[PDB]
Design a protein around this ligand. Sequence first.
Ligand SMILES: Nc1ncnc2c1ncn2[C@@H]1O[C@H](COP(=O)(O)OP(=O)(O)O)[C@@H](O)[C@H]1O
Ligand SMILES: Nc1ncnc2c1ncn2[C@@H]1O[C@H](COP(=O)(O)OP(=O)(O)O)[C@@H](O)[C@H]1O
Ligand SMILES: [Mg+2]
Ligand SMILES: [Mg+2]
Lengths: 374, 330
Amino acid sequence: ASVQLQNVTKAWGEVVVSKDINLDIHEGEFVVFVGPSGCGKSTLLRMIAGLETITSGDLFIGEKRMNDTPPAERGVGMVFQSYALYPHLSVAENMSFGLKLAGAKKEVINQRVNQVAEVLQLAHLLDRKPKALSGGQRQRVAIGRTLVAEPSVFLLDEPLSNLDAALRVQMRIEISRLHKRLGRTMIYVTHDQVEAMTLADKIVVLDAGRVAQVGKPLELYHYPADRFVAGFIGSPKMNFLPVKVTATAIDQVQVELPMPNRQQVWLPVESRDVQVGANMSLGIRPEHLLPSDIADVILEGEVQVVEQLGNETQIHIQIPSIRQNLVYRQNDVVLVEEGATFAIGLPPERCHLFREDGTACRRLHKEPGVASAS
Amino acid sequence: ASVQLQNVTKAWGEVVVSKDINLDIHEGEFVVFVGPSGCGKSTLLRMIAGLETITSGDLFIGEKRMNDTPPAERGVGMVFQSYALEVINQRVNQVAEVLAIGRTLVAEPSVFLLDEPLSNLDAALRVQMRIEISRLHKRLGRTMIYVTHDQVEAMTLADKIVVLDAGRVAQVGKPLELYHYPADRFVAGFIGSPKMNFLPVKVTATAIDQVQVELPMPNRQQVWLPVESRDVQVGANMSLGIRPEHLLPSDIADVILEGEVQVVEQLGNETQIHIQIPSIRQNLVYRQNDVVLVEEGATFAIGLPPERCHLFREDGTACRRLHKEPGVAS
Ligand SMILES: Nc1ncnc2c1ncn2[C@@H]1O[C@H](COP(=O)(O)OP(=O)(O)O)[C@@H](O)[C@H]1O
Ligand SMILES: Nc1ncnc2c1ncn2[C@@H]1O[C@H](COP(=O)(O)OP(=O)(O)O)[C@@H](O)[C@H]1O
Ligand SMILES: [Mg+2]
Ligand SMILES: [Mg+2]
C-alpha cells in the first residue's frame, strides 16, 4: 500500500524510456497509466515490481525504499497480457497459487477462489486444465490468481487486451467493484483512454517516457495541459484548427480562424504567455460543437462520412474554410446523407488553445465535476 | 463478385460449427460477421476461401460453385493482423491513390476477406484504422467480408451485419435494423455499447399491435407497449428490454423508476449511472450526455419510454416493435 516514485528514471544505453517520474500513489488509490505503445508503461510497472532496475531516483512502497528489494519481497502482485498459466495445474490450482506461497489457511483459500471464480465467470471450469480453456478464459484465470492473492499492491499491465470487446466491458465493471470492496492500492496500465476514464481515481498520461499530466478523469478531459493530452483523452479525437492570435486582454485571448474564413473570436483563456501574431492551435471536441440555430460563430461544410451508431451520429464535415474535417457528434439518429451541406456552431467557452510548444492556455470557463476557484 | 451461401453447414465429427448458413452477399457490399470468439467467424471465412471444406450446402462466388475448387483459383484475397512486408506500375500507383492491404488490393481479388485486422493495435490506432477502411471502401467498391468480435467495428464499418451465435445466424441486416429491431435477446444484448437493460415482466393484456405488461416493482405499474401481439398470452413471463441511452431524464417523467445510485462513471462526453431500483436485481444502467453530478447512494429517478421498450418471449424471440424509428425503412 502507498507507492512513491521520486525522480525515477530509466535508460537503456543512451536511450531514456522513463524520465524523472514523480508520483505519490496514496494508499488504496486506483491509478491508471495511459499512453500509446512505446511510452514506457510496462517498463514503469516492471520497475515497481523489481523486474527491471531503476537507473536513478527512488522508489518507495509502504514508506520503505525498494530499489534493491527482490520482486517477491515487495508486497506486489502482477498480472499482464497473455499470461502463461502452469500447464499441469487445474484452474483452481492456478488461482490459489499465489496465496499458497504466501502461506494461508485452506479455509481462506477456497473462500476466495470460489468468490473470485463467480465474479470472473469461471466457477464451472474450476477442475479443468488450462489446455482445455479459451484464450479469454486463461487470461481471466491469470487475473484471478492475483485477485485471490490480494497483494498490498496490484500491478496490472493491459490485463484485458486478450478478451472479446463484450468481456472487456464486463471485466472493467468487475475490476471496479473489486477495488471498492478490497480498498487495495492498484496501478493499472492501458493504451485505451476509455478504460482509464472508467476505472481510475487518478490518471497519469505518459508521452514517450515523460509524465504529460496527472489528474482526475474530468480534470484531464476539461483542462488538458497540452495538445498531447487533449488529443489522447476523448473517445473520438478533439478537433484542432490552426489559428493566429490577433489580440489579448486580461484572462482573454482573441484569434482568427484559418484560411479563407478569417473570422475573429474571443476565447476565455489565460493570456499568460501569449503574444499577438502567435500561430496557435484551437481545440474543440466533437461533442462540444453546437447545432447552429445561430451560435455567433458558424462553420458550414460538406459531409464526407456519416457513422450511425444508434445511440449517436458522428458526422465528418469538410469546411470550405479548408481544413481536415471537423468531426461532429449528436445524440440519437441524425438524418443526413454523405454529401449534404452541414453547418455547426463553435462555442468559445468550450474551446481550448495550445501554443506552438504544445502547452495550453488554461481555460477559465468553469466546468462541472472539477473543483474550481471562487 | 457477389458471394452466396446456401444451407452451408460445417461439421467436425459430432460438432457442427456452421448451422444451415444462408447468406446473400451482393457485389461491392461491405459485410461484417460479428459474434463472440468461438462462434464460427473464422471457419466461415476459410470455407469461402477454400482453406476449409463445406460439409453440405452450396457456395457461390458470383455465379459458380466453388465448393470443390482449389483456393488459388477462387480469386479471394485475405488479410490478418499486420503483414509480412507498365501494368505493375499503373495498378500500384492506382491502388496507392484510393488508399499491406494494398498488396491484396493490387491483386484485385473477386472478394476481399479480412479476419480481425485491427486485432492487436492500440485503441486510438483501431479508431483511425477503421475510418481508413471505410474510406477505402467508399472509393473502391469491391466486395468485402470482415470478421470481428467487437460490435463497435460492425456498427461502424458494415453495409450489412451478420450476427453469429454459436454457429447459427441470429440476424442479418443493416446496422440500424439490428440496433432498432433486434430479432432476439441475443442480438439485443450484443449490439449496443453499454448493454441493453433487461427487466422481468408479466403480461396482463393484449390487443391488435399492442401488449400490456406489469413491472416488478412493488408498484407493479402496468404499461402498454407498441409491439406485435401475435404470440403473446396473458400472464406469460417475459423480458422487457430498454437501452441505457433511451431511458428518460426525469423532468419528462411519464413512467417513473426511482432507486439508489450504485456507480457513477464520468466519461466527460457523457455520464453513466448504475441504479438499484428497490424491486429488481441487477442495477439499471443509465446514460446521459455531458456531466451529471450525482453521488453514490443518492436517490435518482428516471423514466421508461414505452415506444422504446423491446419485449422478449421466454424463448428469447422478440415481439417485433411497431414504433417507427428514423433511419430504418420498415
Ligand atoms: N530491454 C530493453 N532494452 C532497450 N530498450 C527497451 C528495453 N525494454 C524496453 N525498451 C524500450 O522501451 C519501449 C517499450 O517498453 P515500455 O516498456 O516503454 O512499453 P509500452 O509503454 O509500450 O508498454 C520502447 O521504446 C523500447 O525500445
Ligand atoms: N479443426 C477443427 N477441429 C475441431 N473444432 C474446430 C476446428 N476448427 C474450429 N473448431 C471449432 O470452432 C470454434 C472456433 O472457430 P471459429 O472458426 O468458430 O472461430 P471464431 O468464430 O472464434 O473466429 C470452436 O468451437 C472450435 O472447437
Ligand atoms: Mg506494454
Ligand atoms: Mg476467428
